Amino acid sequence: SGAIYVGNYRVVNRHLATHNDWANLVWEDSSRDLLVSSTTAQGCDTIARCDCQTGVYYCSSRRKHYPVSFSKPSLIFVEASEYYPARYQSHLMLAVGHSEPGDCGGILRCQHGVVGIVSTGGNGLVGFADVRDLLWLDEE
Numbered sequence: 127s128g129a130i131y132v133g134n135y136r137v138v139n140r141h142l143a144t145h146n147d148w149a150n151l152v153w154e155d156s157s158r159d160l161l162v163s164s165t166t167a168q169g170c171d172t173i174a175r176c177d178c179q180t181g182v183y184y185c186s187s188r189r190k191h192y193p194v195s196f197s198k199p200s201l202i203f204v205e206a207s208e209y210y211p212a213r214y215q216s217h218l219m220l221a222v223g224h225s226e227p228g229d230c231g232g233i234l235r236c237q238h239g240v241v242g243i244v245s246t247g248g249n250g251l252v253g254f255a256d257v258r259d260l261l262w263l264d265e266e
């Protein structure tokens with residue numbers, strides 16, 4: 127579980143979005159596993175605006191923060207899970223690391239801010255859904 131709170135936006139894994147998220151939807155993309163909803167409170171996370179390929183992510187299933195190298199966001203095939211069938215996920219960054227389903231929502235961060243959220247796992251890789259291309263998250 128986990129979310130990005132930036133301005134009046136909540137960024138969550140699409141597959142973990144709640145009733146309230148869908149009732150307050152701003153934007154969602156299944157191919158990216160992202161959903162943004164609106165919030166009453168003004169959050170403080172800052173989105174990274176960079177092409178960093180190094181960061182630290184939080185892994186709930188190890189209660190650990192891991193420094194990682196990750197690939198630039200790309201179109202990646204991802205085997206079937208409990209929420210999606212085997213399919214190409216877009217804007218996905220891979221790293222060597224630990225990722226179980228409940229690790230989804232863990233944040234990947236660089237010195238510039240939030241890079242993305244855990245979205246995929248298995249075969250010793252962790253996949254993060256990039257948010258650095260969503261410029262509109264910084265305004266309105």
Ligand SMILES: CC1=NN(c2ccccc2)C(=O)C1
Pocket residue numbers: 128182183184191233234235
């Ligand atoms: C929210 C959270 N952000 N993080 C975090 C902290 C440092 C680097 C990357 C991610 C947590 O462990 C929980």
Ligand SMILES: [Zn+2]
Pocket residue numbers: 174175176177178236237238239
């Ligand atoms: Zn960065």
